[PDB]
């Protein structure tokens, strides 16, 4: 009985085999036993008399079994932690699903079987006993989750028979099968109303948080399971309401459920209206107190933006833009993806090639938003999504050294300095594969792929700036910040490639230029940079 759930042995296949074996005898007692086992499955120790309430109302059994509580601790079968929780929670759904699937469009589509269970489930949902109020919603709601697929199969046959009827006792057989295909459907529909009206409408906003979490998760499952019947504000509103819940698990659950529909979206038209009626809140959740919710709130804005490229305004997206300079890397990464697929999506080598306007836009961004003066944080928040824009230094060097092409506006002094900062920070996060202070553990055993990436990036950095740097430190050799930001690259150069590449005249040029800086500058940081580089 319930000991199968207690030991975790409750399942679907063998349990349905046993249920069918019981049905082989009859369904007269396959309901008495079904109620008896499920009642004790809560965790109490009640009793089932042959006429416990047979002549009376079954609902009366509530207090009668409540008296026989066998109370030991405040924990129902699901609440009792450990394996007795995990295995039971995984197992419970299996029995219900097995019963529904074995129904095979019969018995429940017939009479007195589906109706029998409805009464018990409804009564438990109301009982202020912790047991029933908790595990009924675990199972009674789940039962709607169970039958919606059964009704979902009804449409398929109808459509299949619809073509068969599209076009005698064969035609009269079509007529008969069609009436019955409607009579079952309608009754299954009322059996649905049963749960939603009684088990869902009220338990949806239950006092304790876990039951509400079950309600929202099952409603999201319904949305993914039917893209019509269960895709109307009549059903698409409860989530919008509990979007302002004061707990965190519930809010995460609603956000996840909503993200389900936008995920692999079918471009549902009514969903677009829902997006607008709630954009303000879904955007204000980008700064939620719980940093475990802002991640899943920002990963929904990008999902909306993938299809509906109009609901978001300019200040709405700028609010997200400021979030990329955050402190929590998990939310900063998501802000980076939103920025990437909002603004950064869109002659193989040169200032005129690709990733040129794309790399010209980021300096504009950094010089517009003025929350930070250094670029390390912006560079890191995209190092897992924009791995080709912030790595092709061949164009960052080009944009600062190659002469402006006629028909193209040259960069301002300030824009160039910002680009030098971006270049240096990209060089740093390529060479030392550790994120900036504040974000990241600070200790990490680099994997083989990460070591390979480190070696390749450092080799390219050397092979590129070893020949590029003297010219940079000769043109931008009057400006403090520029020199103090370009004299750090030597520290990130594999100096072994110097010897086995015949690149030594450039070493002489680098040393000569450093001497030129030393004999001409008097700043307390420029000379520090020169000493450290030497």
């Amino acid at each position: 009985l319930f000991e199968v759930v207690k030991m975790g042995k409750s399942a679907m296949q063998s349990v349905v085999d046993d249920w069918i074996e019981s049905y082989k005898h009859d369904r007269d007692i396959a309901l008495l036993d079904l109620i008896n086992f499920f009642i004790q499955c809560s965790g109490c120790k009640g009793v089932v008399t042959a006429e416990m309430f047979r002549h009376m109302q079954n609902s009366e059994i509530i207090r009668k079994m409540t008296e026989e509580f066998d109370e030991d601790s405040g924990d129902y079968p699901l609440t009792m932690a450990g394996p007795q929780w995990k295995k039971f929670k995984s197992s419970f759904c299996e029995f219900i699903g097995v019963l529904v699937r074995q129904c095979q469009y019969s018995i429940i589509y017939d009479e007195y079987m589906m109706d029998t269970v409805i009464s018990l489930l409804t009564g438990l949902s109301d009982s202020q006993v912790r047991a029933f109020r908790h595990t009924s919603t675990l199972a009674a709601m789940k039962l709607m989750t169970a039958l919606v697929n059964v009704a979902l199969n009804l449409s398929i046959n109808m459509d299949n028979t619809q073509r068969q009827y599209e076009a005698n006792e064969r035609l009269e057989l079509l007529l008969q099968k069609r009436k019955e295909l409607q009579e079952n459907q309608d009754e299954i529909e009322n059996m649905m109303n049963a749960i939603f009206k009684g088990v869902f409408v009220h338990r949806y906003r239950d006092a304790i948080a876990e039951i509400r979490a079950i309600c929202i998760e099952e409603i999201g499952i319904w949305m993914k399971m039917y893209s019509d019947a269960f895709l109307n504000d009549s059903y698409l509103k409860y989530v919008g309401w509990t979007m302002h819940d004061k707990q965190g698990e519930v809010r995460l659950k609603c956000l996840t459920a909503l993200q389900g529909l936008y995920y692999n979206k079918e471009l549902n038209s009514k969903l677009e209206l829902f997006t607008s009626r709630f954009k303000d809140r879904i955007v204000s959740m980008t700064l939620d107190k719980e940093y475990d919710v802002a991640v899943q709130a920002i990963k929904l804005l990008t999902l909306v933006l993938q299809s509906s490229e109009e609901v978001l305004t300019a200040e709405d997206c700028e609010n997200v833009y400021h979030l990329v300079y955050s402190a929590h890397r998990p939310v900063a990464v998501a802000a980076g993806e939103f920025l990437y697929k909002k603004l950064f999506s869109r002659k193989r080598r040169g200032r005129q090639g690709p990733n040129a306007n794309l790399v010209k836009t980021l300096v504009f961004f950094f010089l517009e938003s003025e929350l930070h003066e250094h670029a390390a944080y912006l560079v890191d928040s995209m190092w897992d999504c924009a791995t080709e824009l912030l790595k092709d230094w061949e164009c960052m060097n080009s944009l600062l050294l190659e002469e402006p092409l006629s028909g193209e506006e040259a960069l301002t002094d300030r824009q160039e300095s910002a680009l030098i900062e971006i270049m240096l920070c990209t060089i740093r996060q390529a060479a030392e594969c550790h994120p900036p202070v504040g974000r990241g553990t600070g200790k990490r055993v680099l994997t083989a792929k990460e070591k390979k990436t480190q070696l390749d990036d450092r080799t390219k950095i050397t092979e590129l700036f070893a020949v590029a740097l003297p010219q940079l430190l000769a043109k931008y050799s009057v400006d403090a910040e520029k020199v103090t930001n370009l004299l750090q690259l030597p520290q990130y150069f594999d100096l072994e490639i110097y010897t086995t590449g015949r690149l030594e005249k450039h070493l002489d040029a680098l040393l000569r230029q450093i001497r030129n800086i030393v004999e001409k500058h008097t700043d307390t940081d420029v000379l520090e940079a020169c000493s450290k580089t030497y």
């Binding site: 109370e71 202020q128 302002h244 955050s326 003066e373």
Partner: protein, 75 residues
């Protein structure tokens, strides 16, 4: 003493529901920014007291002189 945790409140008031619907200014927060300049990034690197008690006051860059100082740090 049956510890059923049975409480009368198993629902929510519509007044409280609308209050939550309107007053969403208590669940949101401000933005935690990271160092806005390099100097503050450095001072977050070395400002921790563990580093404050294991490094020279006058910055010495060469590992030779750093050892000259830190070898005087006993247990």
């Amino acid at each position: 003493k049956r510890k059923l945790i049975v409480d009368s409140v198993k629902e929510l008031d519509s007044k409280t529901i609308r209050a939550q619907l309107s007053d969403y200014s208590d669940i949101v927060t401000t933005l935690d920014l990271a160092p806005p300049t390099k100097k503050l990034m450095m001072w977050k690197e070395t400002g921790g007291v563990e580093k404050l008690f294991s490094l020279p006051a006058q910055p010495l860059w060469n590992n030779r002189l750093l050892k000259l100082f830190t070898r005087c740090l006993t247990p």
